[PDB]
């Protein structure tokens, strides 16, 4: 599913990303824009055989299991395919696990480069939230 901007904002707020771990909602919508262009089916293959999945391009070497790199971690304890679902629950829950302890949204380089320090509230502007 390719979400509309406000539609994604609405779904992320319903799943609790608004102000999660110090990050206002716009941060998450902006990260998703630059990671997947809001497409839940986005995937990208890496040189180590892992794959990045979903609206937030979560990596299979660490966060989910796809069975393609035996011995890798599945820190979110989910099949990577759940991260391609039109229902963003699995991506949201895993993203909350990623941003915990000393791991901030810097874990997403595109967020750091394209969103951090910008007027992120603009991503939710005009949305029925």
């Amino acid at each position: 599913k390719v979400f509309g901007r406000c539609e994604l904002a609405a779904a992320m707020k319903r799943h609790g990303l608004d102000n999660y771990r110090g990050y206002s909602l716009g941060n998450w919508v902006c990260a998703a824009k630059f990671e997947s262009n809001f497409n839940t089916q986005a995937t990208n293959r890496n040189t180590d055989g892992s794959t990045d999945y979903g609206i937030l391009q979560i990596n299979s070497r660490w966060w989910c299991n796809d069975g393609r790199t035996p011995g890798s971690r599945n820190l979110c304890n989910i099949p990577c395919s759940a991260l391609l679902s039109s229902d963003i629950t699995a991506s949201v829950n895993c993203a909350k696990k990623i941003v915990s302890d000393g791991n901030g949204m810097n874990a997403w380089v595109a967020w750091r480069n394209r969103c951090k320090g910008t007027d992120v509230q603009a991503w939710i502007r005009g949305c029925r939230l």
Partner: nanobody, 133 residues
Framework: DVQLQASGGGSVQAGGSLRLSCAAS????????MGWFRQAPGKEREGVAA????????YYADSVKGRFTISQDNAKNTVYLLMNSLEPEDTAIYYC??????????????????????????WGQGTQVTVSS
């Protein structure tokens, strides 16, 4: 509290080899990257080699390609740098480094090698390597 401890190195004649090793302590998960940087007398620190702990993909500075080999032992959080065909120009203080961020999407550990160590938040004290002329 992250701590990187390296050993190996020392002095050698040009054409010789040395093997450096580095152990990270204090992590429960990660590091994501481990690498080697070096700083010759009076010079800026520069990158040498890096490796993704997740996947083992390696990255080398053009100055050591084909001569140095970086490797890892993920379960033991240790990284190694095999240095063959050493030259006087390789003399320097060598530093073990690690990036502790567990990136969400795939991250190439070689990125920090040429951007002044960007992302490498932990550093060893430095190990001397001296290659005779």
């Amino acid at each position: 509290d992250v701590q990187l401890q390296a050993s190996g190195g020392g002095s050698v004649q040009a054409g010789g080899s040395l093997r450096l090793s580095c152990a990270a302590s204090g992590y429960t998960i990660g590091p994501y990257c481990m690498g080697w940087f070096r700083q010759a007398p009076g010079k800026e620190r520069e990158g040498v080699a890096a490796i993704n702990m997740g996947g083992g993909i390696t990255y080398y500075a053009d100055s050591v390609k084909g001569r140095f080999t970086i490797s890892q032992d993920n379960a033991k959080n240790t990284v190694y740098l095999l240095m063959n065909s050493l030259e006087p120009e390789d003399t320097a203080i060598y530093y073990c480094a690690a990036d502790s961020t567990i990136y969400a999407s795939y991250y190439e550990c070689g990125h920090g090698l040429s951007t002044g160590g960007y992302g490498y938040d932990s550093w060893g004290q430095g190990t001397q390597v001296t290659v005779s002329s």
